Amino acid sequence: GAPIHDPDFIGGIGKELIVDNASDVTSFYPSAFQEHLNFIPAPTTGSGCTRIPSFDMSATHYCYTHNVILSGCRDHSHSHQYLALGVLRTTATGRIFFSTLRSISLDDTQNRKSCSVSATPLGCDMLCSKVTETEEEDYNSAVPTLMAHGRLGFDGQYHEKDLDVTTLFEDWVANYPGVGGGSFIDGRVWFSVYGGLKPNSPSDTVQEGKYVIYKRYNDTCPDEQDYQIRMAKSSYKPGRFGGKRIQQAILSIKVSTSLGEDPVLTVPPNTVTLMGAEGRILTVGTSHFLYQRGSSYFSPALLYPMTVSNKTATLHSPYTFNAFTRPGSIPCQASARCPNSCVTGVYTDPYPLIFYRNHTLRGVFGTMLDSEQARLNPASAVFDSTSRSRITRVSSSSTKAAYTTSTCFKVVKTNKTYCLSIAEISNTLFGEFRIVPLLVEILKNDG
């Protein structure tokens, strides 16, 4: 007797939404923002800071979560998490609405940060880092970061179990969940995780010399082939964190009544993965993907084809979407084209929207920050490997924003495809940010 989306959605959750080999990907564009039940709590005070949204929806229910800090976004002493478990439903008039069933404020003696959620058969699994020190400090402290695998059950109850980080993340100095949603695959919950490796440790040595250069489609890097390789090698040991190696990883835990059961860490060779960064494990149809935040020199949205075997994962040459850029700081700005060492960017993910009959991904939906360096102007659109469709803006005026996580689905009864685009938009009176669940219907020029 577990909760399940209204019958109108059956067959429309987590599948390849648009199969077409003929049409141009960019002929599909988002509608004007749709008005629906806002399920994401806004701040209630002049300085409350709600940030870091994580979302995932299975074929049965959805999971959402965000961090809350009482005094401001800068304060690092303590915070709590908002957690929601729910199911998609429709009005008599066929309007959709995310109907949450368990709504809670998680607040105890611990400071959970960079939290990620996943919709598993047992509820809303969550992966957080319990931190006492700042990011800069955690990297310096050679000991791994404390992590916990929690879960909001259908009964509205929350249980968690700290992970044995001293053994699991033994070769790590710092480790955090990718904030983007995790995914449930073959009896296991998969989470994106990044952090810093202990220099000269087994895990660090194997990644030594390993690098890879991903380029821009239309642009070409003028730098010499030797300079570039030297730059790529160094983009993995950037300045910001004392030249430590920021590694990308994937943790899989067995979904059972025992939290933290059988955790297994996978560290993909850097011959394929760029510098570790926030991420998300997506599952669309039978395909799996790894979104990786563009924290390094690469600007275009990345999606590493992910395939699982047993308890480990394997990544492949990523899909890139040239028009889906993210603001960054020089020399890693939106229009950057050459390899370099940096740690900037912002989390704005791409949701697999349009596929080929052969099942190879063609296009994606997402909300990008349409700006070179400043986190400004959120713009929702559909993207292929090279161009961008018609867009939908939050405001024609310059607007401050941050992270965005998108997820598309179809109401089979109305035969309409929608994309939920959760975005951190600036606010007034009540806090620095208001995380708003934007909604668009995916349209096509003709029919």
Ligand X SMILES: *[C@H]1O[C@H](CO)[C@@H](O)[C@H](O)[C@H]1NC(C)=O
Ligand Y SMILES: *[C@H]1O[C@H](CO)[C@@H](O[C@@H]2O[C@H](CO)[C@@H](O)[C@H](O)[C@H]2NC(C)=O)[C@H](O)[C@H]1NC(C)=O
Q: Which x/- pattern, by CB under 6 A, does the window 212-231 give for ligand X?
A: ------x-------------
Q: Which x/- pattern, by CB under 8 A, does the window 174-193 give for a copy of itself?
A: --------------------
SS3 content of the chain, % helix, strand, coil (to 5): 5, 45, 50
CB of 52 to ligand DAN, least distance (A): 6
Structure tokens at 50: 């709600």
CB of 387 to ligand X, least distance (A): 5
Which residue, 119, 116, 123, is CA-closest to 54? Answer: 116
Q: Which x/- pattern, by CB under 6 A, does the window 351-380 give for ligand Y?
A: -----x-x-x--------------------
User: With respect to a copy of itself, which residue has the nearer C-beta, 96 or 281?
Assistant: 96
Q: Which x/- pattern, by CB under 6 A, does the window 160-199 give for ligand X?
A: ----------------------------------------
β-partners of residue 29 are 443
User: With respect to ligand DAN, which residue has the nearer C-beta, 75 or 186?
Assistant: 75
β-partners of residue 245 are 197
β-partners of residue 80 are 68
Which residue, 323, 372, 319, 384, is CA-closest to 346? Answer: 372
User: With respect to ligand X, which residue has the nearer C-beta, 227 or 356?
Assistant: 356
Is residue 398 within the footprint of a copy of itself (CB under 8 A)? Answer: no
Of positions 91, 132, 166, 317, contacts a copy of itself by CB under 8 A: 91
Residue 143 binds: one of Ca ion, ligand X, ligand DAN, none (C-beta under 5 to 8 A by kind):
Ca ion
Question: Omega into 331 within 30° of 0, i.e. cis?
Answer: yes
User: With respect to Ca ion, which residue has the nearer C-beta, 174 or 436?
Assistant: 174
Structure tokens at 57: 């929806």
Which residue, 181, 207, 386, is CA-closest to 290? Answer: 181
Which residues in the 116-175 window bind Ca ion by CB under 5 A? 138, 141, 143, 174
- Please identify which residue in the block is written with the tokens 């899909």: 319
Which residue, 43, 240, 34, is CA-closest to 135? Answer: 240
- Please identify which residue in the block is written with the tokens 């961090």: 67
Q: Which x/- pattern, by CB under 6 A, does the window 268-307 give for ligand DAN?
A: ---------xx----------------x------------
One-character DSSP codes across 265-280 = EE---TTT--S---EE
Which residues in the 35-74 window bind ligand Y by CB under 6 A? none
Is residue 92 within the footprint of a copy of itself (CB under 8 A)? Answer: yes
Query: In Å, how far from its chain's centre is CA 81?
Result: 17
Which residues in the 90-119 window bind ligand DAN by CB under 6 A? 113-114
CB of 259 to a copy of itself, least distance (A): 17
CB atoms within 10 A of CB 8: 17
Which residue, 20, 187, 181, 12, is CA-closest to 89? Answer: 12
β-partners of residue 257 are none
Q: Contact positions toward Ca ion, by CB under 5 A?
A: 138, 141, 143, 174
Q: Contact positions toward a copy of itself, by CB under 8 A?
A: 32-39, 41-46, 48, 68, 70, 80, 82, 86, 89, 91-93, 95, 97, 99-109, 156, 394-395, 399, 425, 427-430, 434, 436-439
